[PDB]
Amino acid sequence: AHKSEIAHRFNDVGEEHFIGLVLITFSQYLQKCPYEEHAKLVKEVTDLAKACVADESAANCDKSLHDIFGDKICALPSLRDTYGDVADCCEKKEPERNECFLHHKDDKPDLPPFARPEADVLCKAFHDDEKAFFGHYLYEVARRHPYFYAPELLYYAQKYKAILTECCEAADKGACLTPKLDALKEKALISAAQERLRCASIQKFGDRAYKAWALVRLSQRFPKADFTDISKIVTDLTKVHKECCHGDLLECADDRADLAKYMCEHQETISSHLKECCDKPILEKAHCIYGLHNDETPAGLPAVAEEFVEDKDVCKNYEEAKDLFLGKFLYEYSRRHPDYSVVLLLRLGKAYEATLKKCCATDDPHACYAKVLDEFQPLVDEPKNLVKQNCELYEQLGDYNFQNALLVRYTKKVPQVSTPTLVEISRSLGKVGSKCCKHPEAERLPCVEDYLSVVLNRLCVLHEKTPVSEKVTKCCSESLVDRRPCFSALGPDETYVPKEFNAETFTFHADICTLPETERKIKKQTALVELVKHKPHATNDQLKTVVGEFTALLDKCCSAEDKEACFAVEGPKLVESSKATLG
């Protein structure tokens, strides 16, 4: 506690961010309330802050940020809690009142997807009022991604603003703007996932999990750093994400900026590469540190087996100080290994731990553990080959079929997962190919596995509240590190009773012709999940034949003049066709 937290935070981060952070905080709790309630609490909360800044003894100035946040939300029944799904929470005081709000964060609130207006419509909306425009935007992203790394979101606001400035006075708005914007959106969709996994890891496996994973990553990134300095960054980063993940976004943003200050302050003993982040303005600085390229591995690194197979004191260290020593290991194997994905290193360190567990209980531990590292080869080998195989098949099929290949895979693995979920995940899984195979072989594993780790996690967190498949609970619950293996290991389900031919899941309306080719794809891809759900022993060619025909229903019927009639004309004949081609 400061004497007035809200003031400290307000002076620390500044008005514009502070408004930013508070908008996001609110957007994130009450994701279902319309923009105007939000702006209301935001300004209400900014007013109180400016007030406190002014004189620290004003009323409410001593309350915790939660208390302030809470109170304001309960003159939000003043704007009818018609939903009010969590008016329950307002009933209790803290900390329950707050804990309660976090329970209700929803990872897929029932909202029309964030819609892209026409290049021109964006451009004007942006010309008219920057404030409102990016308010709405912060509002809209934050509420679909209730765990989105807040500070980065502000960053994305600042980038989206640069792109808008760029494109909104080109002779053609759209062509300047839509690629640059898709690009960035795909990137935000990744960051949202990354952060989601950090939170998931924190909340469901505990601080140690984010710690461990963090140490590994930074060890690869900052190979030259002593283990002391990597630990401090890890502990600071833990705090920031614990905070960010828990809605304490202001403290999180302060703590974050504090941490980047520290690294910049200490770049010499951390990394050469830091220079190019540390000159930058506040958010590009933290952004830049955040996805910085790995430094090169220091020269003169002793073999890893001196310290870990050969010290007489191997068991003495694992026994007397297990965290200290195993972090050391994750630090040392990791800094020596930018070519691995974090989760691979995590697994390795995990095998390294069981081996010592098993071997230090012997009369001869060394003789037991001596091969420990060589025995890593298999674990290094399993994903190595997998990637080569999958990128083979990516190269072969191309994005759309690579996604289809996975939809069909996945829907067979875990058919009880709801369709749009399966459609979503398989598209993202698909995305890995396009994302990583392009890199040269050695660069790929990290790219792939850690990307997969984010996507699989999206699957888990989607699957969590509305849990339907033992197979996914198991893989999601059992080990964070071994998730991907586990999902890869899944073959066809042997329990699922196949779905019935629902006339409508292959039915339509003129409206779907309003959907860009992209949305149209998801529609066929939903058709295809449905179809494997109907007949799972259906051949690829069979499946390809119906999806191909479904593709041909659209291609005729969204013709110049009348679209409505055809659907009703071929539609049922297109149903009939499909049942025919399958059996």
Ligand SMILES: COc1ccc2cc([C@H](C)C(=O)O)ccc2c1
């Ligand atoms: C800085 O705190 C740590 C250090 C070492 C850890 C090792 C492990 C095992 C080896 C693992 O399952 O990765 C877990 C958490 C850890 C946290």
Ligand SMILES: COc1ccc2cc([C@H](C)C(=O)O)ccc2c1
């Ligand atoms: C480099 O391309 C890949 C490699 C491994 C993958 C694994 C999976 C999931 C985990 C699976 O169940 O097979 C999906 C996509 C993949 C693409």
Ligand SMILES: COc1ccc2cc([C@H](C)C(=O)O)ccc2c1
């Ligand atoms: C291992 O190569 C495959 C297997 C199954 C596939 C299924 C599909 C679906 C049926 C499709 O609608 O085309 C596509 C590509 C595929 C590639």
